[PDB]
Write a protein that binds this ligand. Structure first.
Ligand code: ADP
Ligand code: ADP
Ligand code: CL
Ligand code: CL
Lengths: 526, 526
């Protein structure tokens, strides 16, 4: 029983970009070695990332996993524990963890408990494992489990019956309020009950509609937490096992974030990641003088810097002068480009055009025109100069439909869509507490393709037949044309999501049937 | 002995157990009048398909019990129908009940739970392991559910029990060519295994799916005895001949041609979405192009010209030919037709955008404004008079992003979203072939709530906690207020789907995590 160091790689994957994830894993394995780490543990499915969705069904996936193992086999002098998709001779696919040292696969674990509830759909992709993986390294017995496995009492008791010393847990555990600290409380008490250490490594970063908080930790077999990684940070954390005490050395950490601080940092991270991974030069949003847009403005500025944020105030007849001053003042305090674009002429033109159809008492229709004029103005600026539009609707509004389709719903990312109005106020107060001078004014808080016959054949091949680029070209189509079409299909996933539902007639409809990430990194070549 | 089997080609109202139960009772009584000895309903007929997360509601089992109690009053006919079977441990199965004179003779639990493509049954059900064979009038009936009949191992097990007829309940969604393919495959299976197959399928449009029906009876010699048409709700009777040991062969019309079948499916789906959402009519922009011309014909065939409105919205480069072809189809089909010029609206947008654009060169931005002016105009008319807007984008356009967000993507139902442009031409040609005078001009074919603190508490109860209205009221909230909030949440499912993605921070996000149907008939109480 020798002393050793464990590197927890709190890692943010590019979903589907196996080449990129593998390269970063190698870079992190090198960095852990420089820090005298003897093992490095990566998140669940780290080679491809989470949620990769229907990328996990592509026929060429196994060959890419094999190439990834070949590249990882070149890393020397450190045990690596990482996530991959294990496909067996029969064709079964497993959610798996590999233990590798000097190009030798020491063992493979197949996840036992496949979540298929809430945000999880793992039985669309994987068959469940039945066997356990225990390996001895430097006199220490390591067990391996994946995410949902550590929460199944039966699965963990089985591994405990093998008298494991440390359980290594790979995770893609999504964030929700309170979960980061709740994970630590539960797995600490569990570590104490079973007299074993738990090394809990979690994915970090925003991905489409999800946040992954990271917040990795090491809990000792006495129930005390030895190492605590912060939430929403990508880094390598080192834990040190003491041969004499049979415990990991306790490393002091900062206090846990307050509830609203945690939510706030999560939204900042999610906003930054969506902006960066889609390659946007910046963001733009409508500033109404109200608290939702004021909060979104602060989050955007915290995410990518004021130099990349643009704000537009779009007053109409019933827009108070106080509203304009509060919007202008926050933009000034935060250093954000600010413009004013009046809509009364646009609205009047709509009304003149609609008049012969209306003839009708005024109602929501007239107010909805105002929202749509604003949305179209923002999309004009977005189309021209490329900033992502941030929608400012909150969860209370979206719950009861107090929002306008194609009006204030306009946007490519809705920062507050899962934030109740009650929480919006709390986040605004929190953000102001971070600065000597409130950033949110305090009164705001208290108020050329081919012709269709060729094009459709290429689309049918890519969509309905789910063929890769090489196989579509082999049908007799030109290579650059096929590459361009596939690029356009993947790039417009985000746009298809906002369209209305419609009836399926094919073997592969875009909605419900075909599940692909928006932020998608799957490289075209085999 | 000879007997008659009634195949109930049945269209459920998803989630409306009361209504589905009453209609099942009506069909069973109708089948008795026609001397049927058994009546077989579709998969999950009591609740419908896809009911999605309604299948997880805690009060579901009590509603199933009431439905069984109501069905127990039907006497003198064997009923075979779909329901959600919840056992003492709380596990849920996708099940079929065999009932006669208020007695459950047997229960079958589906063995093969599809979790691919459009199916997510492992989100809701555990799999069965046992077979249900019952003898009635000397005939051995086996019972299977949908995906079960496509699993050779499952069916071979029934063959080993010497079944005479396999009864199959199905919620099999439509895709082009599938109605006839089902008959060819299951007739050969019937011949291979020397058993008859009674194949009953759900029919009707539901949200993004079409169910074609096309129920049938295949004899053990491989010949089809009875063939129901596609896209019709009806009761079909098959007669078993004691002497020949076969069902009597009943003459049917020829199978629909490929494009005739697609066309009828789109008409049916459009009608069902319109009627089940309770819209007075539909409205659409007529561009003179083939997509909107086809959508107009489908809308008229669906609900009648008196409930269809068309608007031509020309701009500077809108050809006079385009306006005439749109007007002429409207006149030919008897559709109200109006013209709304957008020149002034677009000019107002340009004037407002000018100081932001400056001397940036014109591009797609300017043309996108035209699409957005049109969409806002259509939504003005929809908001004021209540017609559903039909969007006319096709699958080729949606694949490569050759559409505009909040412009020509505007709509509440996208008739052609899964129809490639290549198929659009064939559907227009088909529709013209039905009348002496083409409907589509040939030229077109060749070109007051509570404040947010109370509101958010109620929403948290309904959403995060998934409580029924009585349990939310028991927290101390006013009954009418809770009822109104729940109504508004359910009524705005369609709207939330069209909003931008955003990051989850709660235990129940609207996107991905919470999966409810749009056309939702779940009754509020108990
Ligand atoms: N069930 C539905 N399916 C599709 N579209 C619908 C449905 N119910 C309403 N709509 C559309 O949504 C519109 C109402 O939403 P919206 O335009 O945002 O304005 P409002 O602020 O009045 O809610 C209707 O005018 C109609 O076009
Ligand atoms: N990855 C993305 N996520 C969210 N929004 C995006 C993304 N890519 C582009 N957008 C938005 O979609 C717009 C492009 O679509 P659209 O407005 O319909 O114009 P166009 O017809 O020229 O494509 C961009 O201007 C931007 O606002
Ligand atoms: Cl989790
Ligand atoms: Cl099917």
């Amino acid at each position: 029983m020798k002393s050793f160091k464990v590197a927890l790689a709190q890692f943010s994957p590019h979903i589907g970009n196996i080449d990129s994830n593998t390269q970063k894993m190698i870079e992190q394995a090198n960095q852990a070695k420089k820090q005298d780490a003897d093992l490095i543990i990566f998140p669940e499915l780290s080679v491809i990332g989470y949620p990769a969705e229907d990328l996990l069904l592509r026929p060429n996936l196994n060959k890419r996993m094999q190439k990834a193992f070949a590249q990882l086999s070149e890393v020397k002098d450190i045990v690596m524990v990482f996530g991959f998709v294990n496909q067996t001779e029969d064709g079964q696919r497993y959610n798996s963890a590999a233990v590798m040292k000097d190009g030798q696969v020491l063992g493979v674990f197949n996840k036992h408990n496949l979540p298929n509830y809430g945000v999880f759909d793992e039985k669309r992709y994987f068959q469940k494992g039945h066997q356990h993986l225990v390996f001895e390294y430097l006199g220490h017995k390591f067990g391996v489990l994946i995410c949902e496995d550590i929460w199944s009492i039966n699965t963990v008791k089985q591994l405990s019956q093998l008298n494991v010393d440390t359980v290594l847990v790979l995770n893609s555990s999504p964030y929700e309020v309170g979960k980061p600290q709740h994970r630590k409380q539960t797995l600490s008490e569990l570590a104490k009950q079973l007299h074993l250490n738990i090394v809990y490594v979690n994915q970090v970063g925003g991905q489409d509609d999800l946040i992954f908080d990271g917040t990795s930790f090491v809990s000792n077999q006495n129930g005390e937490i030895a190492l605590q990684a912060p939430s929403f940070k990508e880094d390598l954390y080192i834990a040190e096992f003491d041969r004499d005490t049979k415990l990991y050395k306790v490393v002091e950490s900062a206090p846990a974030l307050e509830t609203f601080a945690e939510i706030y940092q999560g939204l900042v991270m999610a906003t930054r990641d969506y902006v960066e991974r889609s390659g946007f030069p910046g963001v733009i949003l409508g500033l109404s003088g109200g608290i939702d847009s004021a909060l979104t403005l602060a989050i955007a500025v915290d995410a990518i810097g004021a130099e990349r944020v643009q704000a537009v105030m779009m007053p109409y007849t019933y827009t108070s002068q106080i509203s304009v001053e509060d919007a202008a003042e926050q933009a000034r305090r935060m250093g954000v480009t600010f413009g004013i674009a009046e809509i009364h002429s646009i609205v009047n033109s709509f009304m003149q055009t609609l008049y012969p159809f209306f003839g009708s008492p005024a109602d929501a229709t007239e107010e909805n025109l105002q929202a749509r004029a604003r949305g179209t103005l923002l999309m004009g600026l977005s189309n021209k100069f490329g900033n992502l539009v941030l929608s400012t609707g909150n969860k209370s509004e979206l719950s009861v439909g107090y929002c306008t389709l194609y009006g204030d719903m306009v946007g490519g990312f809705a920062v507050l869509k899962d934030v109740y109005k009650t929480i919006v106020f709390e986040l605004a107060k929190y953000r102001n507490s971070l600065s000597e001078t409130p950033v949110i004014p305090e009164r705001v808080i208290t108020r050329s393709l081919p012709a269709y016959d060729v094009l459709d054949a290429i689309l049918y091949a890519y969509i309905e037949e789910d063929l890769g680029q090489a196989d579509i070209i082999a049908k007799g189509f030109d290579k650059e044309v096929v590459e361009k079409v596939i690029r356009l299909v993947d790039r417009n996933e985000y746009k298809r999501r906002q369209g209305a539902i419609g009836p399926r007639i094919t073997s592969r409809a875009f909605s419900r049937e075909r599940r692909y990430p928006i932020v998608n990194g799957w490289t075209a070549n085999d």
